[PDB]
Amino acid sequence: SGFRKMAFPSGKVEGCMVQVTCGTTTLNGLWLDDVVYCPRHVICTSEDMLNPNYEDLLIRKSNHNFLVQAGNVQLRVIGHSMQNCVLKLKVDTANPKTPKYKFVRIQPGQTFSVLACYNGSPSGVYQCAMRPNFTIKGSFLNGSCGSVGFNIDYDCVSFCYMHHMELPTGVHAGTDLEGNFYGPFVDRQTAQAAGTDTTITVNVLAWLYAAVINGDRWFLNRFTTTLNDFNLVAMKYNYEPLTQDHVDILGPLSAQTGIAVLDMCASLKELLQNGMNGRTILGSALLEDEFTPFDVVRQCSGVTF
Amino acid sequence: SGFRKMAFPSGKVEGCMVQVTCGTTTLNGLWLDDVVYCPRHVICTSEDMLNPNYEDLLIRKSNHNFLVQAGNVQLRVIGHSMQNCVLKLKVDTANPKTPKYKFVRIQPGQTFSVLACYNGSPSGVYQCAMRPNFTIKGSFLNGSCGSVGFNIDYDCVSFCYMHHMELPTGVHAGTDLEGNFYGPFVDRQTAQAAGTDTTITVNVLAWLYAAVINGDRWFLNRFTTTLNDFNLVAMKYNYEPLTQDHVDILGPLSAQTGIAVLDMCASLKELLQNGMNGRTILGSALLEDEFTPFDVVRQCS
Numbered sequence: 001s002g003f004r005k006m007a008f009p010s011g012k013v014e015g016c017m018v019q020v021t022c023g024t025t026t027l028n029g030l031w032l033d034d035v036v037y038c039p040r041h042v043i044c045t046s047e048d049m050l051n052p053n054y055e056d057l058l059i060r061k062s063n064h065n066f067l068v069q070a071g072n073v074q075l076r077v078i079g080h081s082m083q084n085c086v087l088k089l090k091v092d093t094a095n096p097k098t099p100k101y102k103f104v105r106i107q108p109g110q111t112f113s114v115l116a117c118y119n120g121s122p123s124g125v126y127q128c129a130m131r132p133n134f135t136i137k138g139s140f141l142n143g144s145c146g147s148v149g150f151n152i153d154y155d156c157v158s159f160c161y162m163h164h165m166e167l168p169t170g171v172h173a174g175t176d177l178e179g180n181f182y183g184p185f186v187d188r189q190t191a192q193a194a195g196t197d198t199t200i201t202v203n204v205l206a207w208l209y210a211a212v213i214n215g216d217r218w219f220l221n222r223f224t225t226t227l228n229d230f231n232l233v234a235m236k237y238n239y240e241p242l243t244q245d246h247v248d249i250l251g252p253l254s255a256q257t258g259i260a261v262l263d264m265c266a267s268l269k270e271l272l273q274n275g276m277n278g279r280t281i282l283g284s285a286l287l288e289d290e291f292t293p294f295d296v297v298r299q300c301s302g303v304t305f
Numbered sequence: 306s307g308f309r310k311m312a313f314p315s316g317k318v319e320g321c322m323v324q325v326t327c328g329t330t331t332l333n334g335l336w337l338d339d340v341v342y343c344p345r346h347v348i349c350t351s352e353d354m355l356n357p358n359y360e361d362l363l364i365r366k367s368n369h370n371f372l373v374q375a376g377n378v379q380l381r382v383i384g385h386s387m388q389n390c391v392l393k394l395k396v397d398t399a400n401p402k403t404p405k406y407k408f409v410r411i412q413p414g415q416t417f418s419v420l421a422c423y424n425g426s427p428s429g430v431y432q433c434a435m436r437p438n439f440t441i442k443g444s445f446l447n448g449s450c451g452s453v454g455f456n457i458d459y460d461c462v463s464f465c466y467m468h469h470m471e472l473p474t475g476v477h478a479g480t481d482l483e484g485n486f487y488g489p490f491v492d493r494q495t496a497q498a499a500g501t502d503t504t505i506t507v508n509v510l511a512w513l514y515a516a517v518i519n520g521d522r523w524f525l526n527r528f529t530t531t532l533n534d535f536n537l538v539a540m541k542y543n544y545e546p547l548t549q550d551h552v553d554i555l556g557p558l559s560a561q562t563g564i565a566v567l568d569m570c571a572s573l574k575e576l577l578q579n580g581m582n583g584r585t586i587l588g589s590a591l592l593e594d595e596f597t598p599f600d601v602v603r604q605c606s
């Protein structure tokens with residue numbers, strides 16, 4: 001019993017975190033095989049950030065300008081190239097702790113674990129979701145750039161996020177490990193704002209199934225709904241549309257609890273229109289949307305890595 | 306910016322997790338140097354669990370009755386002893402991945418990270434707190450026994466909890482790494498129940514200071530309170546008493562935000578009276594109590 005916001009064990013990623021220093025800027029790098037990946041803005045001064053020409057800034061750098069520190073050992077940089085908003089520093093040594101890995105780009109609503117790092121040293125691990133507006137509500141301070149987001153599928157780490165910046169609202173923006181930003185953001189010190197956020201509907205439904213699995217049924221009702229009527233209601237409350245794919249994905253949870261997906265949608269509709277009336281669900285007074293259907297099944301079945 | 310429930314990176318603990326089997330029972334063990342620590346109830350059958358005499362059950366065991374698996378390698382048990390509710394299995398190999406570590410017994414309100422494990426394999430990491438009633442609101446299934454709670458300070462792992470059981474309300478009970486239970490619990494299937502749980506007041510105040518540090522002031526008011534009037538009001542909402550120790554502990558956060566502790570206590574009294582009126586504090590519609598003053602300072606600017 002119990003249901004917690006749970007991150008993947010971070011050990012496989014911790015063995016990859018390094019410190020990258022270029023001039024006065026110090027941030028985190030991800031050392032996999034003989035390449036260190038880090039945000040390309042490590043080459044910028046605070047003035048350069050206003051309007052950077054990364055190709056021009058990078059062409060002026062030599063391999064020795066990048067100091068890469070792995071624990072208390074200096075890695076020698078033997079090459080450097082840029083791929084989108086990520087800088088790839090070729091090093092002479094393959095990371096002996098390199099896990100089986102892949103670079104994957106995730107979709108909004110998908111969750112991942114963040115290993116927050118400062119000076120190449122892991123400080124904490126937390127779970128979060130890629131919001132529908134492509135930001136992450138992370139917890140990051142200055143020096144956290146280059147911290148990564150990941151999932152573990154069997155013994156393979158899928159790196160999906162690299163931290164680049166904080167927007168004025170305190171939410172965060174970053175890229176996949178190929179340097180493509182999630183969202184309409186650019187790596188420049190300029191006026192940028194996240195779009196209006198929405199709630200991840202399929203994830204709320206998954207969390208309602210987790211509450212039922214854990215013994216909370218007060219919100220269940222005798223009613224069902226159509227997918228079209230539910231989406232009309234859900235659109236009114238800034239909830240993401242629920243697709244037939246989402247309904248299919250919730251199939252196993254529906255079969256385990258005996259509550260059809262459109263039956264759970266009727267519970268959700270009532271919760272949106274009437275609130276919780278002083279009650280909580282899994283210790284929360286708000287509908288939680290940062291657990292996917294897969295996360296719920298994984299936690300309520302004890303999958304290991 | 307931002308404020309998340311954040312666990313310590315679990316790598317240093319993952320390299321210590323092993324599977325311990327005694328007959329038909331399989332649970333997790335913590336392998337540090339040449340000793341594997343695990344709940345003593347690994348020697349019990351489901352029958353034994355009502356009134357087990359652990360000394361009597363253990364005396365009938367030999368070293369070769371305990372199967373310890375570290376990854377895909379079987380460790381050889383060369384000795385066994387019981388210390389309180391923990392079984393210590395001496396093995397013939399020191400764990401090469403043993404971090405710098407310590408065993409610490411924590412007090413209610415303290416937080417720690419849990420590395421939930423099944424069959425010696427880590428499944429997930431989460432953050433929790435030792436409740437005032439000495440239970441933890443964990444997320445654990447059958448086979449999770451032996452999973453540990455820890456904190457990391459500098460490069461040293463302070464092990465503070467080992468999971469032993471689930472109470473009928475779905476909350477969890479366990480021991481420190483010396484095998485002493487937290488709370489009035491016993492490692493028996495006898496009818497046991499947690500005492501009425503209360504909110505960790507000092508932690509709620511710390512989290513209100515975190516909200517102020519992160520730019521949220523809507524809940525502040527022009528009032529102050531005496532510590533005794535605060536406690537009289539707080540107890541009515543099942544909040545733990547706030548001691549002068551707690552007030553002292555909140556000193557640094559009070560100095561950083563410019564809000565005196567008793568001034569923040571008056572905001573808390575008002576929040577308990579009014580609720581949040583559709584507002585949130587750090588993305589939460591409830592008052593959060595699983596962040597200590599130490600956690601807030603570590604995480605916040």
Ligand SMILES: O=C1C[C@@H](C(=O)Nc2cncc3ccccc23)c2cc(Cl)ccc2N1
Pocket residue numbers: 041049140141142143144145164165166167172186187188189190306
């Ligand atoms: O001031 C900056 C630095 C950097 C950035 O956002 N870094 C941070 C990242 N995360 C949490 C932070 C908290 C507090 C201060 C900085 C933080 C940056 C990177 C880029 Cl790509 C564009 C602009 C900027 N502006």
Ligand SMILES: O=C1C[C@@H](C(=O)Nc2cncc3ccccc23)c2cc(Cl)ccc2N1
Pocket residue numbers: 001346354445446447448449450469470471472477491492493494
């Ligand atoms: O049924 C039991 C087994 C064990 C225990 O609680 N195990 C678990 C531990 N954690 C989460 C569980 C979830 C679901 C089922 C079991 C769980 C135990 C240990 C002891 Cl010391 C005393 C009594 C028991 N009774």
Ligand SMILES: [Cl-]
Pocket residue numbers: 271272275276285286287
């Ligand atoms: Cl609601």
Ligand SMILES: [Cl-]
Pocket residue numbers: 249252293294297
């Ligand atoms: Cl599924």
Ligand SMILES: [Cl-]
Pocket residue numbers: 410411412415
């Ligand atoms: Cl303590």
